[PDB]
Amino acid sequence: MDVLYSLSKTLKDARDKIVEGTLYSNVSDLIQQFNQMIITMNGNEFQTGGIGNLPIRNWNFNFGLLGTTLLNLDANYVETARNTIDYFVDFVDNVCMDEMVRESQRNGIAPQSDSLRKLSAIKFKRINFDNSSEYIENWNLQNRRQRTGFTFHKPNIFPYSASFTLNRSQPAHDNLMGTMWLNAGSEIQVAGFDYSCAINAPANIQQFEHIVPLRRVLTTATITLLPDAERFSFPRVINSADGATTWFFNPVILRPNNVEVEFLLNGQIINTYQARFGTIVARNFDTIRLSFQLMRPPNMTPAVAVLFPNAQPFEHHATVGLTLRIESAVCESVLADASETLLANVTSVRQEYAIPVGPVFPPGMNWTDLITNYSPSREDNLQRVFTVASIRSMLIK
């Protein structure tokens, strides 16, 4: 894995640094590493592919060393360099597509393809170069069991869970009470509704609560906390819990009284925020507890007093919402987010070559089913395949 990143880093630098007319002192330390790579890789044969429609390709390396001495690199040197680089780039492309496609339940952090099991010897250890990308740094730090952090912009930590809860209900569905939520991507939109608007609740206050457990512990998260959840604020008809009948929801929106957002780690309150909106911070957490309440307004104009009678027919239903959007967060495990394209590369390779469903990953690489049951073996497989996807995304655009 280290030598695969090293091959790709030298091929990227040798497409970048070895150009026409450049001075030799700019590339004097890269040509020695590329010659060490050629010297190491000669005499060895590899075999990539063999699963799904990924074709079996045989790789044989017989190349001459870049020892001509130039002061400014002329176009002859650039053309022979482009030939050797194009062959090695095709090789590492097929090794990366052979490694992202395989998985194992037993020990997923180990290389699974034959080519990367062959590259994991000490004969190939002199290929090794700097490990400067974030994924290979976290690979090398977790290979020695130290703390890592992946910085994500809007991480997909929440599985898709659009549902509700009726704390007070009946088959008439004309006096309901409870919460509704949308957990999607990095965004929680929650809305507790009461049809009576707390006309018989004690002190005209109805307490709502919504507890979101996470799968991995997020660290140093900037979170936009806004009131008035926008999706649960227009009238809609909703199927029941058993899916038998449908019930109508005509909301009018009160502001959330007494918002308490708590960030729990192992049941301990790490951060708490009482009636503070805008951008908040949560330094260390794996559970988000939103505790908002609906208070009946004690003074109402005649346009408002016709909405909430004391009797039964409520044509306008009180609804109170919050919105919580994790903008950026540092997570020790791998995830998906709106910035990288690594999950897209993994799914593109697994869908392009018509790959059968294996033992670990969900069918079709369903990220909702992958983050719903995010086991440590699936975590190891996901980190390995994302690291190889980062390597191929360095070489192949």
Partner 1 sequence: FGMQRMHYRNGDPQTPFQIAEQQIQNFQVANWLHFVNYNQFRQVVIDGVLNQVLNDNIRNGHVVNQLMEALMQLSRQQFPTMPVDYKRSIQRGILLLSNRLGQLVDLTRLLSYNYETLMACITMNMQHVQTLTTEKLQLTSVTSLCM
Annotated binding site for Zn(2+): 153
CB of 315 to a copy of itself, least distance (A): 9
Q: Which of partner 1, a copy of itself, none sits in contact with 99, Cβ below 5 to 8 A by type?
A: none
Token representation of residue 180 = 């509704």
Token representation of residue 73 = 């690199």
Tell me which residues in 101-120 interact with a copy of itself (CB under 8 A): 105-107, 109
In sequence order, the β-bridge partners of residue 191 are 180, 321
- 246 makes contact with a copy of itself (CB under 8 A): yes
Q: b or e along 208-246 (b: 16 or more beta carbons within 10 Å of the residue's beta carbon)?
A: bebebebbbebbebebebebbbebbbeeeeeeeeeeeee
- 168 makes contact with a copy of itself (CB under 8 A): no
Site string for partner 1, 114-133 (x = CB under 8 A): --------x---x-------
Q: Which of partner 1, a copy of itself, none sits in contact with 144, Cβ below 5 to 8 A by type?
A: a copy of itself
Contact between 150 and 334 under an 8 Å Cβ cutoff? The reply is yes
- 78 makes contact with partner 1 (CB under 8 A): no
Q: Other C-beta atoms within 10 Å of 320: how many? A: 28
Please identify which residue in 59, 61, 80, 204 interacts with a copy of itself, judged by CB under 8 A: 80
Which of residues 122 and 172 has its CB atom nearest to partner 1 in the complex? 122
- 212 makes contact with a copy of itself (CB under 8 A): no
Q: Which of partner 1, a copy of itself, none sits in contact with 121, Cβ below 5 to 8 A by type?
A: a copy of itself
DSSP string for residues in 204-266: GEEE--EEEEEEEEEEEEEEEEEES-STTSS-EEEE-SSSS-EEEE-EEE---EEEEEEEEET
- 162 makes contact with a copy of itself (CB under 8 A): yes
CB of 268 to a copy of itself, least distance (A): 8
Please identify which residue in 45, 53, 58, 71 interacts with partner 1, judged by CB under 8 A: 71
CB of 125 to partner 1, least distance (A): 9
- Residue 14 exposed, middle or buried by CB count within 10 Å (0-12, 13-18, 19+): buried
Tokens 């360099």 sit on residue: 81
CA separation for the pair 297, 129 (Å, rounded)? 67
Stretches 24-32, 220-228, 335-343, 353-361: which one binds partner 1 (CB under 8 A)?
A: 24-32
Please identify which residue in 49, 185, 192, 256 interacts with a copy of itself, judged by CB under 8 A: 185
- 262 makes contact with a copy of itself (CB under 8 A): no
Contacts of 151 (CB under 8 A, 6+ apart): 134, 328, 329, 330
Contact between 343 and 220 under an 8 Å Cβ cutoff? The reply is no
Where along the sequence are the contacts to partner 1 (CB under 8 A)?
Answer: 24-25, 28, 31-32, 35, 39, 42, 62-72, 74-77, 80, 84, 122, 126
